[PDB]
Amino acid sequence: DLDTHFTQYKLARPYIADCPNCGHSRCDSPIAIEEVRGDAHAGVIRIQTSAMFGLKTDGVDLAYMSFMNGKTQKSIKIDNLHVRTSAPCSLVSHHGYYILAQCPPGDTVTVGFHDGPNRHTCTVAHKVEFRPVGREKYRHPPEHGVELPCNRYTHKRADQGHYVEMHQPGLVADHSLLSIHSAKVKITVPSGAQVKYYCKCPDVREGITSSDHTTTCTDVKQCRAYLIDNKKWVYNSGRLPRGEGDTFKGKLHVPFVPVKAKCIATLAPEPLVEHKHRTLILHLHPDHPTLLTTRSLGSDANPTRQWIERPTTVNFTVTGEGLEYTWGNHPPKRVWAQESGEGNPHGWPHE
């Protein structure tokens, strides 16, 4: 699709905000990454840029990229963005501030394209794993092993399953906003917005203050270029401060929700589950860390816990009423006993 929820698209407009670490003396780049979410366990990561790529703010094409340079957009191709995490990602779809991308897992996320007088890249921390939700935990994107139940992302961008605060935005600097009132620096709107203000010099800065500007300060770089977008409510980033005198309502959804089904997944290479006489001999040979653990079945209790991330023949003494064997977030298996070494006389010879 291109159009999935004009909830986000129409009612949001890009903005440019500071990147938390960029190492160009800490560049400002419109790819300022907040909310990395490798919270789908299926190879896929949702990333948030501070700019609203997707549809420009209109009806046409996920294949554009509209960030702010100035107070103005810069409506160019989607593919001029480069999300990456470890190895280069492959886009799945963009919607709003949010992109879904097939990426390697990563402790960080590292996005970047040339913009400004620099190379304008952006990086941020967020712990990602494509862990099974259970007694296993995994790294790399699926390419092996059995499927078993964990999170996975929606390819659907209409989701009202959660919503992120976007109600009354505020500033980011865009001193392209800030014109001059013929000696003193003058607040202006990006494309509409109730834009609040102050300078180092005295000015009113509580209430709506789009009709107030500072009449005592000349320097542009000591004043509050604002975007309270109250008709195109933008993502509320940490690198986008809020107003304090205004209130608008415009809480706006997130397109991509990690949902649980049969995620494309992993299963740590096949364990040998064999029952001998009241004993599960278990040759084990995993890849990703598997918590093997048990539930000795019957009147019995006897659990065992040991993370197995190393090949080990272990044993679990199966009782008459059974033992259970829980090779990670692979579903619990079960074993009864009375033996399984074969041959307890308890009959009458005649054969």
Added chain:
Amino acid sequence: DLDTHFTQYKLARPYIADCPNCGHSRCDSPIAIEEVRGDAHAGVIRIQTSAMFGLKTDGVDLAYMSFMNGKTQKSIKIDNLHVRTSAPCSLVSHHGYYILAQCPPGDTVTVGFHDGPNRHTCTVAHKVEFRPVGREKYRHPPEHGVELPCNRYTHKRADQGHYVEMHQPGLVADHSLLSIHSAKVKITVPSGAQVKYYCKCPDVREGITSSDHTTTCTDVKQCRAYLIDNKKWVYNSGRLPRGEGDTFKGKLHVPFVPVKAKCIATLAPEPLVEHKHRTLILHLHPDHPTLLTTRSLGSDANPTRQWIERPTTVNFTVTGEGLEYTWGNHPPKRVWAQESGEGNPHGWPHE
């Protein structure tokens, strides 16, 4: 280039194979890496892409690029290709479906060109190693220290020294293979291949044959999309099944065999072969794991194992006929007995 082994080279077609980690952790692309060979003690890896870069079907240049879009080639410049491991390689030569490339070490192999309807890249896990010939343990050799007789793959092409069976390529998915002959589903060849075609419906399915054809059962998913090669050979892969019945012989060399060369190689910063009375004290100053070991030259064996990556004066009690000392896979020392003490007089007023 060389056509002295047009056995593989000329008679090689672009081969299409599924990608297991790509754009949703899965995509359709020609490329998909089998038989990665970090088995050399060097720095170079022999790789098989599924795609047949090299020539086209002619004889000229390893610097063209023929991958599959359709069942047909796309014989273009090699400039859109990127062989990489976990970092960009430098090509050495391509011959057949096989590329030799001096690559940094890497857990994965990552190939990709955007020439498809999608991102059209491919990544897969495959084990690469380099280590010292005997003794020492390193992965990829340092940039300093001695050069010494590693295995390494050729600087050239069209060779032989070993051969892997490449006896009949067969069926791979691609519905360009299985077009429709205006009612019934129709097998096609890459450039000419003897196709032992059939479908689920009863037919002959063994023999050296392009006399096996089934049209009785119709659907591309109910029939065997084949390139049974025997004069257009590709290297055999897991994503390249063969016809169920008899092999069409086609055992084919590797033109990228391991040869001796002077690798940048392994030897951690210089040892000191010190001696006192019937003892090799050995002041050692390595920066890398060097398997030191010694051998007391008597009928005593005196084995040793000790990794030295720590600067240490160690000792080995030299027996009465010397000791030898084997400082990694850097050349053996040898040491006589008698005693020393480093030029100490033992008495010297002459009789």
Added chain:
Amino acid sequence: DLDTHFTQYKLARPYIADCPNCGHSRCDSPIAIEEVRGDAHAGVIRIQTSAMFGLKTDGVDLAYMSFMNGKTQKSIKIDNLHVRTSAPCSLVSHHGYYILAQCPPGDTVTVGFHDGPNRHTCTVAHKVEFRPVGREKYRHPPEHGVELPCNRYTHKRADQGHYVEMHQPGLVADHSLLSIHSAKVKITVPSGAQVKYYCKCPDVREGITSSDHTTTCTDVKQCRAYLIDNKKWVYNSGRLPRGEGDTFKGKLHVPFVPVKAKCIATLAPEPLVEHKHRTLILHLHPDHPTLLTTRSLGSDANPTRQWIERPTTVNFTVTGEGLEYTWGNHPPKRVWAQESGEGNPHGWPHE
């Protein structure tokens, strides 16, 4: 981009060199890295290429790039250069043989402009400080917690605040230097040179000489293809060797000196100091390892060492003569008590 201290620029020519490491099979790059000055506690790196970017031989601009192709320059744009570390840097300026780039933090340095079918980049290892003198260490100066002195390299190049010993353009490899004068081995200069010389055959077998060329043996490979430019004064690289005779030593500045700035710097998130009676409980939990040590003050010494990155309540027994608490190589804070632990309003001693 402008050039003012023609001390380095004019009195120089780029000197061809060979990269120390550039994969298993090295690329020859005349931008070979010596003298990394990345030991700034900021994340910024000054690199020395063996190439003399700057001028072409003109009067203006560091915006060009004169590296060596042959013995001759190749005077093109500097904008093809990419220093990078953990992500792309932004070049700041080149001056002399030295390029400065505002980088993300990184221990090592990796410089490169691609040329030819070879990588043509150059990288090197170099021990870097990311701490001031005294306590703690970082491998990446925090951007979390308080900022306190960080060395950093300039945002400029006009700067002569330190000086390295310099000589002159020594010898360089390349047979472009030595033609044959039809029976004699013939020096060819692209810059003018007083050439210190000898051949395999006897003549002046020191080559402590002014300008000479030994003709007793003739062929470039058995003769001294050296270009000692004595009308130029350049920095001594390791990938620049020099003649065996005269040096023209002359202390000549470095364009880049480590200075303090608004760098992300060397203190991780601030301690949470708690105080009970004569004892500091301290839950501590930064984002980066802080070498904590204390000095329970007075004639009591009490040093402590513990790397703090963990979320752990630790203790340092405040004496009655105070304590100091030394959160890294931050200057010690201090705290005395005899009663803390949330007070005892007296109606009785400690009521």
